[PDB]
Amino acid sequence: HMKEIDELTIKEYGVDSRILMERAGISVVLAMEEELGNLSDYRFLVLCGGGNNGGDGFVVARNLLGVVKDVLVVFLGKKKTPDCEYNYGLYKKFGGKVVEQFEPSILNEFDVVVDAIFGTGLRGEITGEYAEIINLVNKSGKVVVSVDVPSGIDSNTGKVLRTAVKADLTVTFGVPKIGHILFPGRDLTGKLKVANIGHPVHLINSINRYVITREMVRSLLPERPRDSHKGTYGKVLIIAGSRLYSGAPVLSGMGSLKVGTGLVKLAVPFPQNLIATSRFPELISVPIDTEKGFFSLQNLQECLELSKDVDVVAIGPGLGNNEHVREFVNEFLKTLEKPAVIDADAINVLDTSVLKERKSPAVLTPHPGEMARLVKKTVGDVKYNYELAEEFAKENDCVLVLKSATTIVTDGEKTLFNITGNTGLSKGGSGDVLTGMIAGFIAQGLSPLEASTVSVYLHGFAAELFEQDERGLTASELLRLIPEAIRRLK
């Protein structure tokens, strides 16, 4: 929590709370200037609550006085905290104008709204004149700059507390908050700038949950020593596909190859295995003899044999979800002593007791529909629920990759948030590619958590490099863009 960090910085390091508040306010001014250019022609309406968010607001307003065309503060609170009171006092001593009554027409004489109503101190739903004013701002079409967090977003979860400000720019202090990272909060934040306001760097770095950055992924990418051969870069087996789903294995297999894996084999029911090599003859696609087009216990021994000569096994894409699949997946995972990447229909039939008894590592890659069925909760209770994800990973000794527009990656100790990607990934097949990518990076020597961190980043970044409209992106095009994502990352 930034709250712990503010407190320690004040009480133990000895930085006056007023100095942090001044630094906060001026970083808002500089952020606005970077975004709007010269501020001097603009008229500013600063909406201040009675808390420290409002106090930051008063610092902003005071620093604009005499330098812009107009500044007005609407003070919407009842009582003021001591720092808000101090900064209100300065704003007035410097000649600033404050009103306590809000007029619907007020928005008309201003170009920029600075939202300093509520920050991390929001508790409960917004109602009354707070709500009316936020709704009026959202209908106004003015430029909106939010202080710390858009008022109405819960900074720990990203949820909207009845209504919330939609900002063009949010300036936050020290570290991004969870509510800027998860949706709907991420959407209402608009462009996010993270300002250094003077916290010791040691405190800033000690936060246990963070955004996966380009620099983090660059330093995790495996080395490609020149004196190498395919064995240097590992082997993956993908157990995938069925009479119903002949394409999923292909997307997973190429996912492994495009991230640099040395050798990829699929095991796919015959004749569906032949589909893979008709499209990408660099893949090896082993025919598995099945009774009715689905993997079953009759195939257990062959798959365990194929697994002896690989570094990692991915299972699940396109398997189907029926009883013979369920028996195979669970007996296989119970006996397999290799890292496993478990996706799709392998999750849908997974007995989670099996994860507990496995000595080898696992990564699970559910979407929220699959996570919901796995833990027997509703989609809406698991979606963006990073605490549930953490508890699950810790209890089952795995890495959990919970896919969504912001993807959560956790082993129960460390939790990372991925924000690359766009809606071209909201289409069948995009998940099957990611499964291959993860197995691929594991085969090359990354830990399951590392492999997952790198893959979700690069997968999202590849989607963003599609040249035409994102809604037309398909999994095949995604594959082509992976090596461009890798180049641009370096």
């Binding site: 970083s27 952020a31 996010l192 700038k193 300002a195 250094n196």
Partner: peptide, 6 residues
Amino acid sequence: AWLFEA
């Protein structure tokens, strides 16, 4: 970079 991260 001293003041702002994106």
